[PDB]
């Protein structure tokens, strides 16, 4: 009786030895701007943590939430497991002493964690556009499900995955002015490509290796809109041109990167057993669809249950008595309280080592019966 | 049956810079077949509003490509096709102006692309830099008047 | 050279440009422990050994050592692999007590020498048995095959 | 050249040590002068594939 | 290169992903395409399906797009790789003295011992964390005014 | 002692050649060969 | 010749967020019998 | 047709060579560039390899 109790009471990470840093800044932020970050880590490490951690190597404009120039990560390795003793020295409170430690920093978003092994444990979630609508629609969408995140537990810091909207330069061009002053659209494509974009022209010789040639504008003259004014352009009676000549300029609004999730836009999401009330939270036309480990885990006793009749079958034949394997299969749960009661009393939860030495020692008492009740 | 395709494509590419033209524009294709139709499903419209090309064009570019991509599922075959932005020239018109379906041609490839065009703050920067904005040149068309006052 | 002069001058592209021998892109960069640095990320195929691989690359990068520069060596920063070596060398540890513990545990319960060498060669026979089984079926030897033994 | 007439002063260990693989011969050098052909009004694409 | 995520969306991304069809044994598709310039396309196959075989057939129907993507994709180089996706192990090239610079050092990693690291067996996929050399060419728009110059 | 910058390989015929082992293979055939036998006369020194 | 009586794929365009293609072709009036092939004129500046 | 041994050297087979990666159970690689115009690369596989 107290047994059932018990193993509905219970609910293993190991500290690798080393783990990531993540950094992200607002989205247009200059890579200095991160490259002051990246050095507040470092040294926040290096020192802070001078007992543990061995070496950093961060890498500025690289990052596993996609590329750019305001991303960053930082690895970070620790001293030998032998050299760090105790409970506050393992990496699952160095990653959470540094992370609390990291909320001072102003207008980024630094977490350092720990991987598993395999593949979090949370509901990775997809928003596809199945009508034809847009990215106002879906981004105006997003938020909508993303608001209704009251309530309250796996819910919690539930928030989207990719980059809110940026701001952008729209240079417009006039086709007919160009014709009229006798330019030709495609020097000044090719201008602005080169100029302000670069321009792989082809391969040289490098101590004996093949490597490429790039074209573009040094780096004073591409960095304002208001550069644009000192390019020119040939025109077809041999006089230059300014771009200001055929063109309008203009700030606008657009996103730096662009999901798609079976072929459809989408846009991703990142005490309880997996939400499974959040699928009826409803816009115009979009849908829901889970992946990665929320697609995998979704799509125990059947197996355990026909084990445990197999067995009283196997010990009936052994002792011919329909009544005598009753006996054998008795100090089942009498063997089964050493685990519960040793793994309710540290916190074990129901790993799969707990779940697997559960049926090593039902599988012993057995052996322990038997010898006896043969002799008996 | 994967061996089988593996060592018809390794043994057709001994003999793929022979075709004269095709071996671009999508040409060689090698891939397992069957003969007959699992199933084939159809799509009408109860209430009189598509036609045949607005009823195709739906199952051409909302489910086609998702039963394309099912479990099982080998060669799909549409009965019908997808929109495209037809232009339908008139010989009798281009010859009042002086123009041909070259003259065509070009003017909608001149008129109708996407051009990438750098971008603002881009690395490597000055000391001092605040923005990292990107540039939009033109775009593509959308619409039938756009294609219309080309 | 470029163009020429009306009077015969010549413009090189050196009067019109900075040359210079860059990188190919100036998005990325790293630093370790703050001084300048490189460095590779390697990742693993789909079904290759993460062991004998990281083997193979330390292996390669002894061949190409010897012809460095002046003053140019290699750290290892963040690396998964000896953690592995030393858990599954940390369970073998273990078990290889727990036989003299029976050895003696059992001794201790009967205290004729002679008798308590019989369950020390029994256990070892048995446990070498489960590797060429496990050898036989096509499987590996991995944590929960060491704690499956032990 | 230095490793071979270096190894053949032992005979005794080692034998017939060749170099499989052809030596420099001759070659015609041409140079087209940019500054020559630009001049006259040339271009360097139709000297090339002449 | 220098293009944004509409751009590249379109003219790269539904290029592509509209003939990855017909591809056996595939659970789902997910692709990115970011301001950078980089298309990134993931087709996750079922657990136990044959990774090689499974590359060559996206192999097979990628082929058949090469000749609608535009030559700046092109020239570049697109790649399929079965590789993981965290980083087995990152290597890293310090100079104690202090006669090379971030560039020197990533430039030579590149050039000589990148290669061989590509080459061995187990290694799906290298990131340099850095850039190689490439002769780069700084243009002057006041020069090219002057000289009447593009 | 080439001049720096100068390295080697053995290729072809002597790639595998240094890459493997032939006393290893033999010697437990020994041992297997001799606890045949002695499993055969059921005892030792006849195997010998 | 070929734009006229077969039809010419040009380039792309965005559909609702889709790919599609561009033709140019004759209309079906002009593209009948034989007799329409002096219907098409080609540019020299005369059109012949 | 036509080129020489360097042209065919640093135009053909370096560029060709360095996409050789990603290539399971491999050996080693050698190559040839002659002056007849011909390049002749060969990868030499594991034994057991298919």
Same mark, same amino acid.
């Given at each position: ?376 | ?150 | !050279? !470029? ?104 001794? !201790? ?42 | ?50 | ?7 590249? =969306? ?13 591809? /056996? ?8 395409? /970011?301001?950078?310039?980089?298309? =990134? ?8 399906? /044959? ?23 092109? =020239? ?13 192990? @990152? ?17 030579? @990693?590149?050039?000589?011992?990148? /290669? ?9 996929? @290298? ?24 | ?48």
């Amino acid at each position: 009786v107290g047994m059932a109790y018990l193993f509905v009471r219970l609910p293993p990470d190991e500290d690798q030895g080393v783990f990531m840093t993540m950094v992200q800044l607002p989205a247009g932020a200059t890579q200095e701007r991160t490259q002051k970050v990246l050095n507040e880590v470092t040294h926040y490490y290096l020192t802070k943590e001078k007992n543990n951690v061995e070496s950093v190597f961060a890498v500025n404009g690289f990052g596993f939430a996609g590329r750019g120039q305001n991303t960053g990560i930082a690895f970070v390795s620790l001293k030998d497991w032998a050299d760090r003793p105790g409970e506050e020295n393992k990496v699952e409170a160095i990653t959470m002493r540094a992370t609390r430690a990291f909320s001072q920093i102003k207008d980024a978003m630094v977490f350092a964690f720990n991987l598993p092994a395999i593949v979090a444990t949370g509901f990775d979630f997809e928003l596809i556009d199945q009508a034809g609508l847009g990215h106002e629609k879906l981004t105006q969408a997003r938020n909508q499900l993303l608001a209704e995140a009251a309530k309250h537990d796996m819910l919690t810091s539930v928030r989207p995955n990719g980059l809110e909207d940026t701001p952008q330069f729209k240079i417009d061009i006039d086709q007919e002015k160009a014709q009229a002053l006798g330019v030709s659209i495609n020097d000044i494509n090719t201008t602005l490509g080169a100029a302000w974009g670069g321009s792989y022209v082809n391969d040289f010789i490098d101590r004996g290796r093949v490597k490429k040639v790039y074209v573009m504008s040094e780096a004073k003259y591409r960095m304002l809109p208001d550069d644009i004014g000192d390019w020119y352009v040939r025109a077809a009676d041999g006089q230059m041109v300014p771009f200001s000549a055929f063109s309008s300029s203009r700030w606008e609004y657009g996103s730096p990167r662009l999901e798609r999730y079976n072929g459809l836009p989408s846009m991703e999401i990142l005490e309880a057993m997996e939400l499974m009330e959040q699928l009826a939270s409803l816009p115009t036309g979009v849908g829901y669809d889970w992946t990665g480990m929320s697609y995998q885990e979704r799509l125990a006793p059947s197996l355990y249950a026909i084990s445990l009749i197999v067995v009283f079958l196997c010990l009936a034949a052994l002792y011919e008595s329909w009544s005598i394997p009753f006996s054998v299969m008795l100090v089942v749960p009498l063997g089964v309280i050493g685990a519960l009661l040793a793994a309710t009393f540290r916190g074990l939860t129901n790993d799969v080592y707990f779940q697997v030495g559960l049926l090593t020692t039902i599988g012993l008492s057995a052996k322990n019966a038997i010898l006896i009740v043969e002799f008996a | 049956a994967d061996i089988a395709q593996v060592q018809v494509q390794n043994k057709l590419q001994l003999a793929m810079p022979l075709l004269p033209q095709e071996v671009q524009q999508q040409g060689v294709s090698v891939e397992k077949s069957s003969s007959s139709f699992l199933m084939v499903v159809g799509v009408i419209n109860t209430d009189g509003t598509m036609t045949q090309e607005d009823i195709s064009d739906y199952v051409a570019a909302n489910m086609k490509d998702a039963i394309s991509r099912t479990s099982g599922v080998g060669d799909v075959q549409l009965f019908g096709s997808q929109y495209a932005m037809r232009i339908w020239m008139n010989p009798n018109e281009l010859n009042k102006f002086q123009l041909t379906p070259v003259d065509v041609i070009t003017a909608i490839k001149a008129q109708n692309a996407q051009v990438a065009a750098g971008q603002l703050g881009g690395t490597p920067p000055v000391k001092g830099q605040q923005l990292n904005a990107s540039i939009i040149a033109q775009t593509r068309l959308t619409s039938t008047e756009e294609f219309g006052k080309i | !050279l !470029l163009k020429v002069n009306q009077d015969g001058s010549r413009v090189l592209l050196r009067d019109v440009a900075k040359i210079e021998l860059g990188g190919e892109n100036y998005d990325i960069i790293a630093e370790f422990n703050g001084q300048p640095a490189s460095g590779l990320g390697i990742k693993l195929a789909t079904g290759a050994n993460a062991l004998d691989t990281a083997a193979a690359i330390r292996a390669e990068l002894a061949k190409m050592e010897p012809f460095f520069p002046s003053g140019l060596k290699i750290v290892y920063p963040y690396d998964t692999t000896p953690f592995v070596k030393i858990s599954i060398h940390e369970v073998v540890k273990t078990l290889v007590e727990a036989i003299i513990l029976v050895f003696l545990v059992m001794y !201790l319960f009967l205290q004729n020498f002679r008798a308590t060498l019989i369950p020390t060669i029994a256990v070892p026979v048995v446990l070498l048995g489960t590797f060429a089984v496990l050898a036989a079926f096509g499987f590996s030897i991995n944590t929960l095959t060491m704690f499956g033994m032990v | 050249n230095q490793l071979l007439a270096e190894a053949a002063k032992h005979p005794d260990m080692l034998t017939s040590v060749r170099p499989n693989g052809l030596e420099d011969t001759p070659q015609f050098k041409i140079d087209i002068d940019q500054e020559k052909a630009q001049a006259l009004g040339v271009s360097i694409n139709d000297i090339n594939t002449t | 290169p220098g293009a944004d995520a509409k751009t590249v =969306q379109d003219t790269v991304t539904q290029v592509i992903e509209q003939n990855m069809n017909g591809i /056996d044994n595939l659970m789902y598709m997910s692709s990115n395409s /970011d301001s950078t310039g980089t298309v =990134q396309i993931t087709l996750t196959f079922e657990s136990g399906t /044959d990774a090689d075989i499974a590359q060559v057939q996206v192999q097979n129907k990628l082929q058949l797009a090469m000749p609608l993507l535009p030559q700046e994709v092109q =020239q570049q180089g697109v790649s399929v790789e079965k590789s993981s996706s965290s980083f087995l192990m @990152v290597v890293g090239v310090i100079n104690t003295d202090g006669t090379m610079t971030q560039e020197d050092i990533s430039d030579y @990693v590149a050039a000589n011992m990148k /290669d061989a690291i590509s080459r061995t067996s187990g290694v799906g996929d @290298v990131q340099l964390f850095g850039s190689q050399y490439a002769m780069r060419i700084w243009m002057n728009p006041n020069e090219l005014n002057k000289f009447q110059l593009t | 002692k080439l001049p720096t910058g100068v390295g080697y390989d053995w290729t072809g015929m002597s790639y595998q050649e240094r890459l493997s082992q032939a006393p290893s293979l033999y010697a437990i055939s020994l041992i297997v060969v001799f606890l045949c036998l002695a499993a055969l006369y059921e005892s030792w020194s006849i195997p010998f």
